[PDB]
Symmetry: C3
Subunit: 124 residues, 3 copies
Amino acid sequence: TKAVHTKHAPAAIGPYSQGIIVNNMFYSSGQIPLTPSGEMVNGDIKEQTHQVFSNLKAVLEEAGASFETVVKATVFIADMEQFAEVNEVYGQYFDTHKPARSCVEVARLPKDALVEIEVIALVK
Amino acid sequence: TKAVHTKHAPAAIGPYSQGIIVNNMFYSSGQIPLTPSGEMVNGDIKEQTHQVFSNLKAVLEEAGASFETVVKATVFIADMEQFAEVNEVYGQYFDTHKPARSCVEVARLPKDALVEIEVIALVK
Amino acid sequence: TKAVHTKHAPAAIGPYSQGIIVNNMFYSSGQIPLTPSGEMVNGDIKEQTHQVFSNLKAVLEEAGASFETVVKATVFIADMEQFAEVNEVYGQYFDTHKPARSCVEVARLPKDALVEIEVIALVK
Ligand code: EMC
Ligand code: EMC
Ligand SMILES: [Hg+2]
């Protein structure tokens, strides 16, 4: 296995890696709405979801994967009432290639993020 | 890789698939107590859990897998006080074959479901 | 494919196994702060986190894996305010090897545990 590191996603500060490649698969850590420089995006839920996807895009590509090779995503949201809004952004990235997915509302997320998304993808 | 599609489980409406096959593994989306026609199952926690299992059975079989090949499941429930009830139904399907599992109470689930379950299984 | 069992981790009572090996990958069930004898270690978040890791170490080793081959972990904590404390202990185990990770505060964990962790690891 190998750790994935890219300056285009917030730095993994602490005991974890942005993602890991093992065999021919890639596992990302759960991405939250932080900018690469480590600041929380303070726009609405859509703006927060966009940063999450920019972060996912960066780690996926550094690992030799892409949204087109994602097989499973788990979405943790702070409020299920915002499902539709997060889904609108989500659908711009997984429009034709559609991964398996699970979505649940949690009590709280790191840095009180409104959304956190993790993915597993094939490395071709 | 292949998206799994079955008319014997609620349709995946939107940017996700009922399940995905990659390498020799199958990943399902989290299944909720909806009938194939899209209606939330009428009834208590056991009836809801049974519908979730009917949905998993449908996607597993379409993927060339079965409850006997499930390796890991994640169970999200609306109320931990109903754990025994969910477990009793869960046990009917994993009678002698026992997957790895994590079970937790979340704040809320899609469509206010009382239970949601996702599985990962080997494709024989 | 096969179930993993070790007397050095709490017995799996119910329809699940402590872990499952499929291909060259090990999937653990979520581990909570129970001692091998089945009772909650009493003590603060630090002691609870250490017990969860003792349990993970036992199932990992029985499966032929180790903390050094863990590729992804999912951490569930009862109180996000305890993130720093749990992270301090977590870092002692994933020191030179840093897996991908996701962390969320759910509504409730089995036995009102303060922390629960599941892992996926490579079997060398
Ligand atoms: C991607 C909507 Hg839970
Ligand atoms: C290991 C801190 Hg969520
Ligand atoms: Hg549970």
